[PDB]
Ligand binder design. Structure first.
Ligand SMILES: *P(=O)(O)OCC(C)(C)[C@@H](O)C(=O)NCCC(=O)NCCS[C@@H](CS(=O)(=O)NC[C@H]1O[C@@H](n2cnc3c(N)ncnc32)[C@H](O)[C@@H]1O)[C@H](N)C(C)C
Length: 575
């Protein structure tokens, strides 16, 4: 209270400059090539900023960044902030129209290309930053207030129209300073892994840099037991965030791969108590935290440090408001719930509140409101998350009233996506389901219509994380006696060679889908692909990669051949 006030918090750049001044020789960044210390990071960043200010001397413009984590991409984030501008991650894994739409929404001037590999941009103004000329020698940095935009993340956008959520310097410095839920210290080594399109990345990067710690970048490829083990062992990562279902996957595959971490946060969806239990009894000294919050409130709203006693609950508490934030639980009538075991909506106040939804006034007025807190009448955001208090005054997550789902940490408005499928030519009806198989989520799509009507165009237009893992055509969507989609019925519906029939039984058991002579059109996804590859490696492989045998071999023709290359299909069943 009064930390709820944006102006009580410093700028990202003021705080970083403070760190760089105190800790010139501490590792700021550790990548495959070495480390960069604070003084070096600061210089590089200032130089690149000299270039930016030359081309965009007026504070407050949106600049893009592309490429997987590198010393250059971090440096770019810093240079952008230093110039009074804000960053937008343009993911080139995504379809052109989608990225172009983002850029239009925030008026993205120029993209700073750190991509190691050749950029097939072709619509967009990319400038490669590596080996850049070293422009005119200095510029005074604008001294902006803490309410300046640091970065943009987008609303789901399953309508086809994603809305920009502008987050502020104060949101970040609030997140990273004066907290109790994690120990932020100069000795911390934070794994930088999460997709920079979304807000866990915020914690992983700024948590370290604002505290004099080191960012340990994953430049080794998708996170899995071996890569994690490597980032911990060789590079000394002691602190990490993992979206709940990735945490689940790792714990199931190789629980000891968590060994060496002092601090681990997970969240982004409802935590699995069994997996939390296994990680904790496996690693009794681990400081484990359940982080909760919407992008609109900047990374975290509530966090809960996990205890022994929690391991007997049906759900891990999401705990309490972080410093610089406040929450209320509201009834249907708008009055705060003061007592245990009574469900209501989570409402948020404080320094984490984002600007609103750029170019959407209605959404903005709907969830960004003024509401009384204590005495004062404060700006607030309504999460749409139903929770309840427990005996100890800790929040306990219930769920949502609208159709919004988390798909392995990704935010989707499912109804709008479904409707998007209905609009496709020759498609009568469509049902979208998210499934909880194997600690992980799957997005399953069943549609009715012309037999030729499969919506491949639409899928090519969807950002990758919005594409169903299975698209099946059906006779009809099963209705119950009450007229409601019969979900169990639907999932139920969704269920040759010597070794070709083995691969397809395996895939069936793992995916919950069909045989007949493709994994990622069959209900596979990146997490399940991890598990499958790990099985295959248990079996006398590991020349068999996440890349080779699955993506290059994804048919089950190509996979029955890649399998029958080294070993037998029936063996994996008991591995
Ligand atoms: P494959 O699928 O191709 O690849 C696998 C990986 C792991 C690479 C891929 O799936 C991946 O990267 N997944 C993670 C995606 C990601 O980085 N997501 C961002 C984190 S979620 C974010 C805000 S949010 O998207 O708006 N979601 C907020 C709502 O989510 C629910 N929620 C959040 N936290 C919860 C907890 N602890 N318990 C229960 N529910 C929770 C609520 O409905 C929120 O309103 C936030 N900022 C997280 C916390 C960082």
């Amino acid at each position: 209270n009064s930390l709820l006030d944006l102006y009580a918090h410093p700028t990202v750049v003021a705080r970083f400059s403070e760190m760089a001044a105190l800790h010139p020789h501490r590792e700021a960044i550790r990548d495959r090539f070495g480390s960069v210390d604070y003084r070096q990071l600061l210089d590089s960043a200032e130089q690149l900023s000299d270039y930016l200010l030359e081309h965009y001397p007026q504070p407050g413009v949106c600049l893009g960044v592309y490429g997987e984590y590198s010393r250059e991409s971090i440096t770019c984030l810093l240079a952008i902030l230093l110039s009074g501008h804000h960053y937008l991650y343009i993911d080139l894994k995504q379809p052109a129209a989608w990225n172009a739409e983002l850029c239009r929404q925030v008026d993205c001037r120029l993209i700073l290309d750190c991509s190691t590999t050749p950029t097939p941009a072709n619509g967009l103004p990319c400038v490669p930053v590596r080996h850049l000329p070293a422009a005119p020698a200095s510029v005074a940095r604008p001294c902006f207030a803490a309410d300046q935009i640091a970065y943009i993340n987008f609303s789901s956008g399953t309508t086809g129209r994603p809305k920009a959520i502008a987050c502020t310097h104060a949101g970040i410095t609030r997140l990273c300073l004066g907290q109790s839920f994690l120990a932020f210290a100069p000795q911390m080594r934070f794994l930088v892994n999460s997709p920079l399109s979304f807000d866990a990345a915020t914690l992983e990067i700024w948590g370290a840099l604002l505290n004099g710690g080191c960012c340990v970048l994953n430049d080794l490829g998708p996170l899995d037991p071996g890569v994690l083990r490597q980032l911990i062992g060789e590079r000394g990562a002691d602190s990490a965030w993992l979206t709940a279902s990735l945490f689940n996957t790792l714990v199931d595959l190789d629980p000891d791969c968590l060994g060496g971490l002092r601090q681990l946060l997970t969240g982004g969806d409802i935590l699995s108590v069994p997996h939390v239990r296994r990680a904790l009894l496996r690693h009794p000294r681990l400081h484990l935290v359940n982080g909760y919050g919407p992008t609109e409130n900047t990374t975290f709203t509530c966090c809960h440090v996990v205890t022994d006693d929690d391991l007997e609950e049906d759900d891990i508490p999401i705990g309490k408001a972080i410093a610089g934030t406040a929450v209320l639980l509201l009834d249907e009538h708008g009055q705060e719930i003061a007592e245990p075991d009574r469900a209501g909506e989570i409402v948020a106040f404080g320094a984490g509140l984002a600007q609103g939804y750029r170019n959407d006034a209605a959404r903005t007025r709907a969830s960004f409101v003024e509401l009384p807190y204590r005495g004062r009448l404060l700006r607030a955001y309504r999460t749409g998350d139903r929770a309840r208090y427990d005996e100890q005054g800790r929040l306990r997550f219930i769920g949502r009233g609208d159709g919004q789902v988390k798909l392995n940490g990704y935010r989707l408005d499912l109804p709008a996506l479904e409707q998007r499928f209905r609009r496709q030519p020759g498609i009568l009806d469509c049902a979208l389901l998210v499934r909880e198989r194997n600690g992980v989520k799957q997005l399953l799509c069943a549609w009715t219509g012309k037999a030729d009507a499969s919506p491949q165009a639409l899928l090519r237009q969807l950002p990758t994380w919005q594409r169903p893992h299975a698209c099946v055509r059906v006779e009809a969507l099963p209705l119950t006696a009450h007229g409601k989609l019969d979900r169990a019925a639907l999932l139920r519906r969704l269920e040759l060679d010597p070794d070709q029939r083995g691969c397809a039984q395996l895939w069936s058991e793992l995916l919950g889908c069909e045989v007949g002579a493709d994994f990622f059109l069959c209900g596979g996804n990146s997490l399940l692909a991890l598990q499958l590859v790990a099985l295959c490696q248990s079996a006398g492989a590991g020349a068999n990669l996440g890349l080779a045998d699955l993506q290059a071999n994804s048919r089950l023709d190509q996979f029955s051949r890649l399998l029958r290359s080294h070993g037998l299909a029936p063996e994996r069943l008991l591995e």
